[model samples]
Target: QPEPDMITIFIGTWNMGNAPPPKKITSWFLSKGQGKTRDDSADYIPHDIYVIGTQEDPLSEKEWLEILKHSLQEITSVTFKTVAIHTLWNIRIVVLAKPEHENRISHICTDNVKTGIANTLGNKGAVGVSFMFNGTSLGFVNSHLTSGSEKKLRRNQNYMNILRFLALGDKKLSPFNITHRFTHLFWFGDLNYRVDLPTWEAETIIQKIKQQQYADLLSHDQLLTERREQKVFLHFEEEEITFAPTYRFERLTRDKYAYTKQKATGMKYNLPSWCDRVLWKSYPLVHVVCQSYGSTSDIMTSDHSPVFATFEAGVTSQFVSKNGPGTVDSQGQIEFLRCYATLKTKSQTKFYLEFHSSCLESFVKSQEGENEEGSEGELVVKFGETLPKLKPIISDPEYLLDQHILISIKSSDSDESYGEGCIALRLEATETQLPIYTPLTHHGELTGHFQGEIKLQTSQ
Candidate 1:
């Protein structure tokens, strides 16, 4: 009983250690263990998209494409084709979509950043792929950060390089606003962060992994430490990790940890890291719900296992035209208004209006607003006629925020001046008309009665 507006994605990340496709990978993709689905209310549903990011795969994007077609074709019951793919040396990203969504995706773009050596090598960098789906933008980036346990500073620097260089859209926006540009952005790969434990705690490890003390393990995770300090991945979000660490395994078939070599002392397992990870950023009413976040333990081809996550990511449908429905896109340079009033006058009495706004610019009517033959915030409305209006100038309303509109009414041919009233412009709300029933007075007496509205327009 889910709505059709949202889409599901099964995202995975791995570091292949410069290897080609393994003889088998069914264990990697079919995993459904550990991490608890946050939403029990949601009945199970097949993923509509698959995004996989791999690092250090020197095989150069070979078997992974076909493997997805034949293997996932029956799993999801639709041929998931690669909507976009980007690679640089060993870092790569692939976004595959269900056949039903083949024609719905657009505005695809790709970018990559290198930071291995002098910011020129591809071994430690990120590759990105972005697209517009329905009406929202989503981006996927695969990265390989510095590998040494003590090289965390270099890893942080590598991340900043990607943030500064991976420009994806036609505008080539500054500082590579990928996080801002994409409504939902995903970053995943073997980022090489480690646990903060000293060598030689073999007995403690056996008890921790066996007792499922995940919280204890996560307490010492370097990535969490880095994020706590906000040194990196500042805007990304990750689900709770229920699965064990996915990296630094020993060869052949599985269940062994490689010893971290020491020059003169004790031996320890390679810091047992959850180095391979999947993290995402969402904004502007874009919601990404993680149904599961866990790692695959079945495959043992490389030194690292793969991590996969399932998400119910919200996607927007048609964007209502800003220029179509009474609202117009920002003409930024123009501000115009036609104000109304309600008052009875004597015989042969014609009325003119003047007001002061909290916004100084609201007073200065531009030349483009047509020569109304009056000063700023002034208008003339003769008897039996509608409110006076402007041609053009301040099409933006943001300038009028938290501002007040006070009006004064007077007869053009007579010496008597009518009463005045005030109303507030929209600041947080979109309402154009506010009640003037509050009444405006002058000289501590009921002088004249005047009520009108100020109008401003803009786009989203």
Candidate 2:
């Protein structure tokens, strides 16, 4: 197969702990914090991803370099005390498929605009990054936005702001046009809002993409329309079946009130919700391979668990391109005149009009039998108009192949999931009838060949 025109990408957020112990971070980025180690009450050892790059907010440029160096090391191994304090709240973009990408990595954000742009304590979490690859650009702004108050307006504003920065404040369509020459965009992250009852306009990545004219890939509404699925409830809904939460703290059971009629009777402390998800700019252009909300190993790393999404860029352009059709040089005109002049019947005029309307003027005029005319005056079609002047190709049955197609499938008890079936296929045209059938497993691995026979199914 030829190289794909699109590429795949993964975007995520992790919080490396800063400041002091017991005040240890709550999310993915687990840090030893100056080796002031306190792994108290912890069931799992710190799985160090990278020791150095935890810089969220620094006072100077020197500190920024230190944090970046450590973070780069962290992408490779588990390192302690490698992360600088300053790079924490900013965004970072990593192009994993470097050689395959042909060096088209893009900007995550500027100092004031990009990575770590909105890291406020008890508000937005650290880490934001945006980059473009192939024809698509992705912006990921991971926020601990839920820690703050649930005032509906601020949450909504924060959500839109992520889009604004990733979109270069609504600059050109995709910055790759200016930077890396890409054309699509994807914006998604841990947006803390319910499916429909989100307080803000863009409480979910899907809503934001729709409002911004981006297509959503995770839309399974067909299932919902058929009542196969139900909508997600708000985080604080009081129903029992809807009691599962991503964040749970019940092993302690501090008060007898902890199991009160409201908390225990309503929800189990340890269940998962449909909080995390993947969003796309356009579904036709992007496809998700797999998405999961919890650890594949079933170990709880953070209160928020962990969410992962794998996606490959898929696209079909809506823009239609056309350059004018072939022009009839004077030689062709002379040939047409030879045919048009000898065409005497008034009915020939009607045939010419119909041929031109059908956009087959050139094909008909180019036929060789031009000079002959019977007593009834044989009809002749002339190419007066060129191809570009023809109408658009929508809802036109005449444009249909007018030719038959033969299809044959090899039949085996092959379960699609098992991925174990292999069969040879061939297509050879004979006449008009197109046959469609599957191969007989009776003939092991035999090729299913389709040979057209001289037969028509319907009116020609």
Candidate 3:
């Protein structure tokens, strides 16, 4: 494990109302506000992973992503690459990973669902990305539900729609639902759940937040109330919000509530509400420890405040041994790459497997036996009747065996398998063998039928 088993993550969401992003977005990730001092590097430590989502009026998705990439590189002082980027009209979600752990990020996939009518098209919906970070499967969803306090049912339905319809193209392409597919999940956005109390009552609670009595105020939060009634988000956990309501604020002010229209017009605005939120749910093996969760009050570019949450995601592992079964030998060295291979057989199905550089070198060396380094071994194929041939589309020693092993599997009269099954790999020339049946699981899904070219990985 070259990197730490635990990674720090920063997740932020903002409803910009079609406005341009702030000139400097440091406040979103860095702590700079009341009760917080600047010039402390510890306070501004860069996160290993960043997940940012936005709704309403963004520049061209291409330009938006490019600008973010530049800004993150400048702020973090480390090159970052986009692991995943997605947009459903104006609603967008982007994930960036540091260079040190970028290779561990794989199987990136996204999906979105529009729950609004024309004119309001992408205004209300959810965009999601699911990927494997070092062997840990994680899902991040950014959603905007129906507006209005009375539309809780519609919001709940939107939730169900995203869980069901939002996907990576097809069911055979990506898994559905956070609980079903991922070990850790985080869902955040302007969920549009308002305070259950009346306008005056809600205002009174907002005022007491500065008095350190915010607990009583949050008791009336519509989202929490709904959860308590088992109406939505049953097992999710939200850090107790220590910040003020993030909605219905003046366009360029920190504390001014925007309740009435300009020029004294009688147009009334939505009451102040804690509409923006971040929540997470994880398995027993993956734990999420929250360091900070609140809104950046210094950012006044939007009527809604941006919410940010920092987490230390601990993935329990005992070094390369736990990276996968047969990965580590008794000498405490990674020796083999072991994972499940997906087979979808009809008339013909093509499968591709790419090993880590070390796995490839060990595998190639094992096949060559006492021969000089850089020697190539004759490729061999061995499987059930379902798979008759294995082809190495690109396996050159010049590149340290950094290539794919393409295989073609066809349904035979003996077998008709069409899903994933366990796979074992052993270096052919070695007298001693790596353990074959060690218990290890993976979430990578490579899919496609042979069409002469290599196929992309698919999740089933």
TM-score of each: 0.67, 0.35, 0.65
What tens-digit string does per-residue lDDT give for candidate 3 at 130-222?
887764667899998888767787887777677667664214322123434555688899899877666565457557755756677678788
TM-score pick, better of 1 and 3? 1
Q: What do the candidate models score in CA lDDT, each in turn? A: 0.62, 0.27, 0.59
Query: Tens-digit lDDT track for model 2 on 1-460?
Result: 2434444443333222221112212222321221112233431332211111122222244543444335434543423332112233432322223232333444434212232234443335323444443223444334433322233344444443443343331133221111111223333334444222222332253333324331231232221111222221111011011112222212222111111124532432211223332333331112433221121112132333233333444422121123112322111110111112223223321222111111122222122222234456443332232212222222122221221111112112221110011111111321233433222111111212211112211112
lDDT of candidate 1 over 358-426, digit per residue (tens): 233233211111112223344324222234342222334433332344455555556344544444444
How many clashing residue pairs, candidate 3? 4
Distance (Å) between predicted and true CA of 8, model 3?
1.1
Better of 1 and 2 by lDDT: 1
Q: List the candidate 1 regions with Cα displacement exceeding 4 Å.
A: 1-4, 37-45, 118-122, 170-176, 262-269, 320-429, 432-460
Report the alpha-carbon TM-score of model 1 versus the true structure. Answer: 0.67
- Which candidate number would show the highest TM-score if scored against the true structure? 1
What TM-score does structure 3 among the candidates reach?
Answer: 0.65
Q: How many residue pairs clash in each candidate?
A: 8, 31, 4
